[PDB]
Design a protein around this ligand. Structure first.
Ligand SMILES: [Mn+2]
Ligand SMILES: [Mn+2]
Lengths: 126, 126
């Protein structure tokens, strides 16, 4: 089983969002609920200017691949700047946030070692 | 543990390559051999024009995100065009190849649901 996706592929999928991540939206591109894939899952997120993926963690490791714009990554309390062309490693349980303080859309893919997004349990900062 | 990487973070590291797939060269940005990361591994790879990482397979599921250029994906015999902005799912042991039929350098990231690259064994097609 092999397949290809881009944003246009999922025009029909409405965006996901939540009060807790204001200015943030996302769609699933590789996910067991959608594609019947397994082992890895991937979504595409947008953080609007002024937007904030607020400090959180979860049990699986995560990789973010930044594709547009720039932001302040919050590495469990140490701030660092990220931008298009960066990849990021977030070990499980590690608290991370990402704010878009620029004027361009901060776009990135994420990846989890799981079949589905929905099997990933989110927790607010301690 | 959280960290960032881009091409510059790994200028010190050398382009590993193999005769089995010519025009192909990669480096490891997220990998236990290097970072003491776990759960996910990521590499960045380049295929020269006329370059083709020949069809093959391996236990882990795999995600490719194409960052630049254009190519032809060998979906176990079913050939699909892919381009910058495309993500690619490939199940465990699904045979896959990828040829660069463009002039630009075909660029992409790969992700494995493994700690390191150096434990994932590549088998040739049969
Ligand atoms: Mn996260
Ligand atoms: Mn492969």
């Amino acid at each position: 089983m092999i397949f290809v996706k881009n944003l246009a592929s999922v025009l029909s999928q409405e965006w996901s969002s939540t009060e807790k991540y204001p200015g943030v939206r996302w769609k699933f591109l590789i996910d067991a609920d959608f594609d019947g894939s397994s082992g890895l899952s991937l979504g595409f997120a947008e953080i609007a200017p002024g937007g904030d993926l607020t400090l959180h963690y979860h049990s699986p490791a995560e990789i973010a691949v930044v594709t547009n714009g720039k932001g302040i990554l919050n590495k469990s309390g140490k701030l660092e700047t990220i931008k298009k062309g960066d990849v990021v490693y977030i070990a499980g349980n590690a608290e991370h946030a990402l704010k878009n303080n620029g004027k361009e859309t901060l776009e990135f893919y994420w990846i989890f070692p799981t079949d589905r997004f929905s099997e990933v349990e989110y927790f607010p900062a301690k």
